[PDB]
């Protein structure tokens with residue numbers, strides 16, 4: 486679990502969105518596993534606007550932060566789950582690192598701010614949904 490709070494927005498994994506998130510929906514994209522809902526309180530996270538390929542992510546299954554090198558956002562095949570059939574997930578970045586399903590929502594950060602959130606994993610890899618291209622999150 487986990488979310489990004491920036492301005493009057495809350496960014497979460499679409500497969501983990503709540504009834505309140507869907508009732509206050511701003512935007513959602515199944516192909517990215519992202520959902521953004523509106524909030525009544527101000528968010529203070531800073532979104533990174535960069536092409537960093539190194540950063541640190543929070544891994545709840547280990548209660549630890551890990552430094553990682555990660556790939557540029559791209560279309561990557563993702564095995565079927567109870568949330569989606571087998572498909573290509575877009576704007577996804579992979580890194581070599583530990584992740585378990587409950588790890589979704591952990592933030593990936595670089596020196597410039599929030600890069601994305603954990604969205605996929607397995608076999609010693611971790612995948613992050615990028616949020617750096619969502620320029621509207623800041624206005």
Ligand SMILES: N#Cc1sccc1CC(=O)N1CCC[C@H](C(N)=O)C1
Nearest residue numbers: 518563566584585586604605606607
């Ligand atoms: N094992 C393992 C890990 S680590 C983080 C998530 C997972 C499981 C995982 O990859 N998914 C299940 C939930 C939906 C995800 C998606 N974006 O389609 C796919």
Ligand SMILES: [Zn+2]
Nearest residue numbers: 535537595597
């Ligand atoms: Zn950066």
